[PDB]
């Protein structure tokens with residue numbers, strides 16, 4: 072559904088490399104019995120059939136307002152013109168399968184035209200693979 076918090080990201084392409092900085096997120100949805108979550112962020116260039124592009128932040132336990140401050144780099148290839156950078160927050164779970172918290176994505180070609188910087192609204196899993204919603208206001 073919706074109202075999943077927001078995330079602050081920077082994503083820019085420079086000389087065939089995509090640099091992404093995952094800063095922090097605010098107001099995430101509770102996922103655990105204790106009312107909090109143990110969030111981490113998965114980054115991928117999709118489609119990724121062979122599942123080779125995945126990178127992830129560390130897991131921060133017991134918070135709905137994580138501050139990761141982590142950076143990542145992807146080397147781009149020509150075929151990436153048809154790919155998107157997918158950013159998904161998931162809850163790490165000690166005793167159950169990990170579950171989805173919120174997401175968004177950027178087209179590689181679009182980032183090449185204009186870098187991304189700022190706060191973004193977290194979307195549901197399907198929606199997140201298709202667009203993003205900046206919230207500069």
Ligand SMILES: [Pb+2]
Pocket residue numbers: 102103162163164167168169170
């Ligand atoms: Pb959970």
Ligand SMILES: [Pb+2]
Pocket residue numbers: 102103108109162163164165
């Ligand atoms: Pb958990």
